[PDB]
Design a binder for this molecule. Structure first.
Ligand SMILES: O=C(O)c1ccc(-c2cccc3c(CCCOc4cccc5ccccc45)c(C(=O)O)nn23)cc1
Length: 150
């Protein structure tokens, strides 16, 4: 599963940099030019997705009532339910990830930073397992980077 692997590399870094405010500096296994540009794109558009969904994101986080790893482990089904409504596009993929950054930041705030890694794992698992056909047609992260170009 190359698409899982790549998806995980991008999402884990973006959540950690959103949570920490630290530009992530962990090297990947090798050059990933698309992966670095996809992180750049999340940086640029992810931030403003959160500012436009400030109200629904807080209301969603309220409901979820997240305090720990058991809780982070128990999000998969709700994630799926909300995400597979309507129809698939890159805007909703950004929403998923950007809400992921919102919850990451919540986790740091509640001193549960070590949960960000499994949270990134859950989002990747759901993304690839629910939207695989569509991502493969859209050419994955290159498609993503082209869609929000400049
Ligand atoms: O009435 C509105 O305007 C509105 C807009 C957006 C949302 C909303 C909030 C959070 C996430 C999310 C998504 C992403 C799918 C599920 O994401 C998640 C749901 C639950 C927990 C999650 C934890 C981490 C990452 C995503 C999560 C979508 C969408 O599909 O359009 N819409 N949302 C809810 C209500």
């Amino acid at each position: 599963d190359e698409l899982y692997r790549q998806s995980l590399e991008i999402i884990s870094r973006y959540l950690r940099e959103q949570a920490t405010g630290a530009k992530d500096t962990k090297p990947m296994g090798r050059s990933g030019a698309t992966s670095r540009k996809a992180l750049e794109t999340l940086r640029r558009v992810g931030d403003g997705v959160q500012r436009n969904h400030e109200t629904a994101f807080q209301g969603m986080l309220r409901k979820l009532d997240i305090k720990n790893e058991d809780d982070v482990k128990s999000l998969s089904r709700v994630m799926i339910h909300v995400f597979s409504d309507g129809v698939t596009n890159w805007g909703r993929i950004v929403t998923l990830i950007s809400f992921g950054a919102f919850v990451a930041k919540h986790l740091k705030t509640i001193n549960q930073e070590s949960c960000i890694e499994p949270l990134a794992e859950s989002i990747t698992d759901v993304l690839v397992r629910t939207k695989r056909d569509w991502l493969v047609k859209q050419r994955g992260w290159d498609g993503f980077v082209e869609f929000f170009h400049v």
